[PDB]
């Protein structure tokens, strides 16, 4: 009960913003995603030793691949625990709970490899899930790991609170998959515009979290320049080794994946902010309004992208 984490005093401080790194030491991860459950939901909502042993193996089944890698998950965490912060009355104990574990959960055992890269090389997955096929994968990976002895963090919550709380889990992890993003934030854009939008609708709150799940999932975009920059390279390191796989299969590469087209990336990214980030930071900032940080430095790093195309940088 009385055992609480510290964080150094620049941590304690900078954890707060949106824009936080988490540093390049490993070994400090855990504490930190310990630090931001306990403050986002309680020191009482998980029993310390069960939630350490269910990190570690979360950790274990993380794959060394440039991006989607064990630093992504609690990236991606560390995102939602400062949306959470920010809007601290509109979510329920179980979302708060479930939410940081869908984040530090949501691309358990990924290779590097596209839902459509899957498809096209038939993997045994693809024949499992015909759609959100890395996304379901991701869950079922969640679950076997829930399942694993001394590992059950929701063990003193009811049949019924557990049950809600691994749906909230699989539907924040199957929104991670962008190819729904699309459709998701048109409608969230249509219903805040009628002023239809009502957070008790239990249909308008999936969707709600859904965006939430695409803006923590995309805030490397978020991150201040030299952040954004270097995590652009493990983003196109991993692209790249897609591309090589898919002239392996006979099949030329869309020109992002392909590594003999390194000269279109910073018109790619141009292209990426303006299709996708800023339409992602832009719905999410008007239905949450205190997550208008997000927007601004997604803004400032489209801008150092032009720069970077107008020979400037
Ligand atoms: C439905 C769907 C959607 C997507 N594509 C994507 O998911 C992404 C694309 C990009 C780019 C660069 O995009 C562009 C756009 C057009 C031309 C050149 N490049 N940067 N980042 C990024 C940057 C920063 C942080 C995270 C991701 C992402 S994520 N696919 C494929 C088939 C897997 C590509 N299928
Ligand atoms: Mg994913
Ligand atoms: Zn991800």
Redesign the pocket.
């Given at each position: 009960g009385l055992m609480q984490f510290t964080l150094p005093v620049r941590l304690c401080k900078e954890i707060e913003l949106f824009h936080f790194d988490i540093g390049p030491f490993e070994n400090m991860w855990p504490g930190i995603f310990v630090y931001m459950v306990h403050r986002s939901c309680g020191t009482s909502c998980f029993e310390l030793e069960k939630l350490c042993r269910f990190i570690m193996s979360v950790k274990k089944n993380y794959r060394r691949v440039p991006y989607h890698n064990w630093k992504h998950a609690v990236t991606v965490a560390h995102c939602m625990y400062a949306i959470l912060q920010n809007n601290h009355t509109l979510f329920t104990d179980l979302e708060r709970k479930g939410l940081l574990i869908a984040c530090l959960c949501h691309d358990l055992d990924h290779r590097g490899f596209?839902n459509?890269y899957l498809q096209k090389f038939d993997h045994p997955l693809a024949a499992l899930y015909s759609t959100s096929t890395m996304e379901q994968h991701h869950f079922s990976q969640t679950v076997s790991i829930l399942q694993l002895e001394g590992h059950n963090i929701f063990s003193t919550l009811s049949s019924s609170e557990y049950e809600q709380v691994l749906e909230i889990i699989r539907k924040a992890i199957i929104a991670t998959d962008?190819?729904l993003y699309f459709g998701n934030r048109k409608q969230l854009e249509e219903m805040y515009q009628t002023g239809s939008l009502n957070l008790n609708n239990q249909s308008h709150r999936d969707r709600v979290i859904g965006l939430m799940m695409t803006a923590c999932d995309?805030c490397?975009?978020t991150k201040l320049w030299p952040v954004t920059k270097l995590?652009?390279n493990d983003?196109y390191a991993e692209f790249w080794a897609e591309g090589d796989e898919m002239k392996k299969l006979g099949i030329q590469p869309?020109?992002?994946?392909d590594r003999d087209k390194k000269d279109?990336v910073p018109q790619?990214?141009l292209?990426?902010y303006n299709?996708?980030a800023i339409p992602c930071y832009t719905t999410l900032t008007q239905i949450l309004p205190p997550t208008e940080p997000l927007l601004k430095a997604c803004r400032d790093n489209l801008s150092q992208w032009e720069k970077v195309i107008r020979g400037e940088e």
């Open positions: 596209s459509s962008l190819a995309l490397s975009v995590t652009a983003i869309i020109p992002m994946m279109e790619g990214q292209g990426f299709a996708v």
